[PDB]
Structures are given as C-alpha cells and as structure tokens.
Design a protein around this ligand. Sequence first.
Ligand SMILES: *[C@@H]1O[C@H](CO)[C@@H](O)[C@H](O)[C@H]1NC(C)=O
Lengths: 50, 50
Amino acid sequence: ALQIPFAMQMAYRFNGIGVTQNVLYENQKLIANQFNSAIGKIQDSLSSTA
Amino acid sequence: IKDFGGFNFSQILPDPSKPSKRSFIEDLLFNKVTLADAGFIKQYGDCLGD
Ligand SMILES: *[C@@H]1O[C@H](CO)[C@@H](O)[C@H](O)[C@H]1NC(C)=O
C-alpha cells in the first residue's frame, strides 16, 4: 500500500492541470468573443464618423 | 465704396494634385478563427460515463 499516495498525488496533479487548462480555454474564448465584438463596434463607429 | 476682393474663402481639399489615398481598412478580416481541441469532448465524455 506504499504506492497508493503516489498515484493519489499524481491523479490530483492531473486534475489540477486539467482544470487549469479548462479555465485557460474559457478565458481565451471570452477574450476572443470580446475582441470580435469590440472590433466590430469600433469599425462601425469609424465608418459612421468618416 | 470698397471692393470685395480680399475675401478668399479657403476650402479643405480643392485640388491637392489628386492624392487619392487608398486606405483599405481591413478591420473586419481581423477575426480569430481558433481551432478546436484534440477531441475527447463529446465522444470520450459519453463513452466513459461512470
Ligand atoms: C485664393 O487663394 C488661392 C491660393 O491661396 C488662389 O489659388 C485663389 O485664386 C484665391 N482666390 C481668390 C478669389 O483670390
């Protein structure tokens, strides 16, 4: 049973890496859609001003 | 009776040698078409279960 905590901490580190990757993916999606919306609105405003 | 000859109303761009500056603002084409992941999002999640 001495090899149980090794696999336990390995699985814990794997789950941590996974949840951090998921958080980073969600943040990238948020940044992407916000950038798209902001660029669209800025282009519309610049066209109207011109 | 003074003559009205010294009144020269200036314009903005009457004839500046026909510059015709081509801006061509490609702001709409600056979109981030992010690629998908390596899978295991709907197939593995439904095949594993519990
Ligand atoms: C006004 O000035 C411009 C250049 O300064 C000249 O080309 C034009 O002939 C002038 N017009 C009059 C009515 O004096």
